[PDB]
Amino acid sequence: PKPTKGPRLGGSSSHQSALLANLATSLFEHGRIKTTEPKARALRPYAEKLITHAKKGALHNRREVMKKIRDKDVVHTLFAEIGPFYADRNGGYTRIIKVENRKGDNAPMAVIELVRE
């Protein structure tokens, strides 16, 4: 999606890519994760488009997701329940909740989760 206007997240583009892929993996594995608010803000569109690929689940879309996720159990869950669960919802698969600031560096924290309504 839209590339970051400013400097990258992990300190380099490759690190940011790895960070985003890992964060999406954890999100789909657990259902909600807690991280710094810029990280969740950057994570929303990425995970939403992976879920979009999973919604129309074909071999081509499966390979498209695997070229980013790298974790086969997570891919299986994504194409077995997460995809079919959001069959009749058009976008907005995730929501962001702002939570209390971190203690060590006062970094704004936020919790990103999948909607289950």
Binding site: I97, K98, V99, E100, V111
Partner: protein, 54 residues
């Protein structure tokens, strides 16, 4: 460059008074019945039970 002169007390205090912290605004919320103050940025999280209230 190095300071050529020692600052007088008036100038030092006048510049130093700008280094201050602002008070966050707090709004009321009902968690487990009891009313308590929370920043409005954390209102939804408090309503969802995601912030520790001591």
């Amino acid at each position: 460059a190095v300071p050529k002169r020692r600052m007088s007390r008036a100038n030092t205090r006048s510049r130093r008074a700008q280094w201050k912290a602002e008070a966050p605004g707090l709004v009321t919320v009902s968690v487990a019945g009891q009313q308590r103050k929370v920043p409005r940025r954390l209102l939804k999280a408090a309503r969802l039970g995601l912030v520790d209230l001591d």
